[PDB]
Amino acid sequence: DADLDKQVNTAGAWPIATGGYYSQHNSPLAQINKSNVKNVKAAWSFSTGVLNGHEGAPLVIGDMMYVHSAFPNNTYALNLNDPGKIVWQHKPKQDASTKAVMCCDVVDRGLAYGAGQIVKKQANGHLLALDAKTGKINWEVEVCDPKVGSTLTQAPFVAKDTVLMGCSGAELGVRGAVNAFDLKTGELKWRAFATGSDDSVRLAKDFNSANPHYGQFGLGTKTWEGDAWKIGGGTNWGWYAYDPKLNLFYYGSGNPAPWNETMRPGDNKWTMTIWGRDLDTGMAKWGYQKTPHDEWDFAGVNQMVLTDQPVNGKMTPLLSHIDRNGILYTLNRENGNLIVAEKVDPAVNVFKKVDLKTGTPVRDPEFATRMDHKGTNICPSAMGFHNQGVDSYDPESRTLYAGLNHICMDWEPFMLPYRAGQFFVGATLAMYPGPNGPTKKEMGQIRAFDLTTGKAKWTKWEKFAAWGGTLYTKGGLVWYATLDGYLKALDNKDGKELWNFKMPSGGIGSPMTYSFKGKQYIGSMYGVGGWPGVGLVFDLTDPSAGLGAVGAFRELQNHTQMGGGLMVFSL
Amino acid sequence: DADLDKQVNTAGAWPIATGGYYSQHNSPLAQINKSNVKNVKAAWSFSTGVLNGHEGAPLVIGDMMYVHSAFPNNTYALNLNDPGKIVWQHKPKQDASTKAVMCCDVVDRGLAYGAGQIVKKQANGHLLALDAKTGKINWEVEVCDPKVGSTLTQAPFVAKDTVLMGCSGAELGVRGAVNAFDLKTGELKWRAFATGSDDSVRLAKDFNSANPHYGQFGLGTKTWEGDAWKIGGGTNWGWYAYDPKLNLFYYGSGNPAPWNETMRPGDNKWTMTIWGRDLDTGMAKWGYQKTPHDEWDFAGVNQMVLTDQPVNGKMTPLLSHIDRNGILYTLNRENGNLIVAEKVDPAVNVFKKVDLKTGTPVRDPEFATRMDHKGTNICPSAMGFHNQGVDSYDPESRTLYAGLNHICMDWEPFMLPYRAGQFFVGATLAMYPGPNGPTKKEMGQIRAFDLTTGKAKWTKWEKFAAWGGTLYTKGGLVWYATLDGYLKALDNKDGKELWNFKMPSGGIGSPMTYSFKGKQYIGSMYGVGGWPGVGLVFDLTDPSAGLGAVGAFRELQNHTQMGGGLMVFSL
Amino acid sequence: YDGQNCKEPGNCWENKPGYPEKIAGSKYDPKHDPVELNKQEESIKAMDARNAKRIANAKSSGNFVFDVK
Amino acid sequence: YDGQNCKEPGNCWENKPGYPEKIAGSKYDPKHDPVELNKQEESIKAMDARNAKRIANAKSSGNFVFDVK
Numbered sequence A, B: 001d002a003d004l005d006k007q008v009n010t011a012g013a014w015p016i017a018t019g020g021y022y023s024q025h026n027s028p029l030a031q032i033n034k035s036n037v038k039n040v041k042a043a044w045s046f047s048t049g050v051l052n053g054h055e056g057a058p059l060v061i062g063d064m065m066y067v068h069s070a071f072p073n074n075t076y077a078l079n080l081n082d083p084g085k086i087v088w089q090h091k092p093k094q095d096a097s098t099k100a101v102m103c104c105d106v107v108d109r110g111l112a113y114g115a116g117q118i119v120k121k122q123a124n125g126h127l128l129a130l131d132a133k134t135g136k137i138n139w140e141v142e143v144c145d146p147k148v149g150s151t152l153t154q155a156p157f158v159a160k161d162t163v164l165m166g167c168s169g170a171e172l173g174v175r176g177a178v179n180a181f182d183l184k185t186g187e188l189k190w191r192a193f194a195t196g197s198d199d200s201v202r203l204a205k206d207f208n209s210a211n212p213h214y215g216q217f218g219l220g221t222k223t224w225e226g227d228a229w230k231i232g233g234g235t236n237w238g239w240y241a242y243d244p245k246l247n248l249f250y251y252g253s254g255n256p257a258p259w260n261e262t263m264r265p266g267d268n269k270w271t272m273t274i275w276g277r278d279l280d281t282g283m284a285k286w287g288y289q290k291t292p293h294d295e296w297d298f299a300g301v302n303q304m305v306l307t308d309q310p311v312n313g314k315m316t317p318l319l320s321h322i323d324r325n326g327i328l329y330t331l332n333r334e335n336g337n338l339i340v341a342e343k344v345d346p347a348v349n350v351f352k353k354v355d356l357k358t359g360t361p362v363r364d365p366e367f368a369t370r371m372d373h374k375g376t377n378i379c380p381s382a383m384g385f386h387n388q389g390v391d392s393y394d395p396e397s398r399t400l401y402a403g404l405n406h407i408c409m410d411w412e413p414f415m416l417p418y419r420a421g422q423f424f425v426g427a428t429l430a431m432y433p434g435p436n437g438p439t440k441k442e443m444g445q446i447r448a449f450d451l452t453t454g455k456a457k458w459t460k461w462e463k464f465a466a467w468g469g470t471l472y473t474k475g476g477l478v479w480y481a482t483l484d485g486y487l488k489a490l491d492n493k494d495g496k497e498l499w500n501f502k503m504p505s506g507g508i509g510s511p512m513t514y515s516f517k518g519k520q521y522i523g524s525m526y527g528v529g530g531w532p533g534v535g536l537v538f539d540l541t542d543p544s545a546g547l548g549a550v551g552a553f554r555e556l557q558n559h560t561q562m563g564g565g566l567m568v569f570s571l
Numbered sequence C, D: 001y002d003g004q005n006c007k008e009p010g011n012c013w014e015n016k017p018g019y020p021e022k023i024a025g026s027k028y029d030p031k032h033d034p035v036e037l038n039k040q041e042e043s044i045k046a047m048d049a050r051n052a053k054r055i056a057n058a059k060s061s062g063n064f065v066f067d068v069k
Ligand SMILES: O=C(O)c1cc(C(=O)O)c2c(n1)C(=O)C(=O)c1cc(C(=O)O)[nH]c1-2
Pocket: A055, A103, A104, A107, A152, A153, A154, A167, A168, A169, A170, A171, A235, A236, A237, A254, A255, A297, A299, A382, A383, A387, A388, A529, A530, A531, A532
């Protein structure tokens, strides 16, 4: 709304989790730069009093900061003039059983803001709007039902008078949908499902008119056998982007359910799809399915980054996105035209390549998955070569700094029944480091990319996956947190590490920045968890446990322990 | 043993929780001083992955640091060359029911060290010796039985080839005793009970020969009616001190049980007693009962500080101690002679004064407790004007910097039966700030004292109780953590605050210091809890809950939330 | 199955060698229970009704109450 | 009762005005059960025996085992 716009246009404020409507996750604040970053020190810190993974990052509205925890999803409001005083706090009362249907740790990716309200959700499915100054609950509505395996983890997204919110639960057969609510009253405006009838999916009359070969009408059911689409997944629990001029919001729908591909023949549209939908009606102008008939859990929910750059010398309105499947996509955000589809790392082998003309992955049967067969050395693994991390874009050098994962896998599915409220995975995996790390053990990378060509500029390897993402600040710095507990700052020119601080626990969110009384501050959550930390968090030791993540990250607990809080830095 | 002595004599090492055998909790490290403390910044941090109160402080042996958490009592070994790597760790498996019989949060006051081993206990009563380099368990024995309400929280104390360990549980009628174990094998050498026959209490033939009026033989039973001494409390869960030349160790025995004074007529010896015992035989050379027939839960377990100072011109081997009852005591540590017994604050009203000749408190009936009567405005409260905090002593100016509490109370007892494993308190309380705070709302003080006169030099007030204690370093600085989350440094000359840092959560331990590569570091645990934080930690709102502490500390949760970790600072 | 043989635009799925074109009646038949399949829709219907009541009650009363009935 | 009137050295307790010299038989009689009072001693006896076994086995075997039988 107008109020959110006011904050977005306030220098040093941070009212949106992804850094702005285009989700470039960057900042013009340049007080901290390459020459003085070595002098950055901790300013203050704040514990949430909660353990488990602490994803996302705090919001800063005016002189107030809002911090959020993992389940039970607590909110803490602080006035920057005195970080020692909790102005107001909201501590939800939720059934412990809520945690039992959360696939990948009891994480929360953050708060949103609009119309003078902090927009927050709870894992148990509630969405609330609280007065930003007093914490008073203006409205509280139900969005997801944990009894059928549906929960809330992603950050809400505010645009105009609308709050976009999507449920999680594809691992439990939840049929995905982006739900839209009135920012002032919490009333349901509409919801656009990821599978089913065109009416339920909300497709515009000219859906994909610019690219009919992507598929248009009737595919939400025709690319499934029978009613399998009813428990077909496609949940969107990642991030959104919005272009005010086009009045289009963008996001990616998740993986189809179950993981057992043999149980769901068909392209399974419209799961794993990049969308361009009208904000007012939710009607899709265009939709591109990145991974037809998923066989690897490449949940297509990753960040959408909108930029305006010259493509072969021609200024073009773009949307860029690095999918779990290891492909960096750049499309024209107005019509959905496919411009770039390149592998973020040569290890990607599920596809020989993505054909720009047919618009689909040229699949390599050797790395497919199927019943009564154990696929081996498949890259990327289900954790993807990119997950929930929020990356940053430098508008000057026109570079995206991507936090990647370098993890591959073995995979064999198996038959299982669907029972609402119970998990519906159907596959056993083994995950391990990809083949290209310097010592073949590295599972993380910070890799800079030109989004118009998909070509890398440089790479910095990390022992563990770069799960949280990166933040770019005009001083020429790439900030990011590591699973082993460090907040780091790199020279955006070559990836050279210029500064670091050992936080209490690994970070799984992306850094944010803001200004207060003439000083630039960098904030990062800490508290390891999420999918990578399930072994440590839930005391698991079986290598195949945690959907196969336990074995891959068995060494993480030798570098970090759980935590929950925020650390702020400045000069 | 000899190995411990080697570490004690190693500049920059910190092998003893209280700073050394005399427990002066100070350091000759002077790199950080009054002129440059303003430049101190966070060096690194480490989360324990546990919540609840984090008492004590880490140990530093050579280039290794050992960190400990609250229940389940985890141990983490880090080499200072790389704090990001956990060299070895020990994470105990204990029954969750253990927490149910712990009176005052599931806290742990620290590790000990001896014969190349980290000596650690667990709340469930186990005491272990782990190789300091590999973490291998050399021995593990049972010291306390939670089934009868006995648990372990205090730090073990190593002297020569002996490990001193005392069980907690007076609130559950546990009969206190200092248990002595062989440092190499864990074999029980002997145990000295706080009540009962002289044989069980272990009194030397010349016990109190220098002060027969203190009482001598047969009082362990004669000052009780019948067998009430069997469940008479007297647990020692505080700190110890040791004089190698005299081969005497010192400590204070706790409060008698139950809290209902009417249920246990008599002086209740030897609870609330300052002891001077031979280390090898455990036989008491002297014993001074500070609070005969306790009526306020003034558990006499506070820190014992050994110093050598001139008393009115004559050099004397001293022992100083600030009891829960609000009295600062200084005795001759060789023979037990009472030299000083002054109120640490004029608000103390349970006693008109302590008579130096009779050696007993001159009780004021107006502020006593008794059945069928509600005592009001009693100072100190059960939390005392001093609790488990470890204070520091500056050998140059000869000053003790005490972390005090300024809290008083209302109290009324009630009849109740004794059942092993069940609480045995028998009193309802209301606690609130003392009458002398600047705005009459302050509950904490850092007050400097001359131990030879008991007179104060200066006072710095704090909103909340100074629970953790203080550390004194040669640069002229008094370091301490606050319940609201700050680590602070004061000018030791006047108490002026020179530096502070907002840690993630309140601190309830005392700061420690060490040197690495010639650089001085200050370390402080963080994670609020203990008695003051029971309301926040256990979601209590009833003002009378938490033994009356909930009401008094109702505002704490508006300044801090739970946490668990360590923060290290340096220039 | 390389994804490049489409029966219709946007419908390029093919059964892998040795696997059926249709799984119903095959050894890979999921045999889903329609009752279970419809549970999400049923839940959403009831949930939407509860929210509508909350919205209506807040509008008419001027105060928002989650537990309104 | 100001604590200054001692019947013997180190034994200065006095009943407060209006309270009994002895609580046995009074309205403040705790009526503690003898067996219940001895539970701590019984526990320590058993515990000491378990530790003795661990210590003895460690000395003869050369390896420390907490659970020996
Ligand atoms: O299908 C779904 O609805 C769903 C939900 C979530 C979530 O909301 O945490 C994750 C995923 N899938 C899973 O694909 C995944 O890789 C993942 C990682 C994490 C995390 O926060 O570390 N959550 C999720």
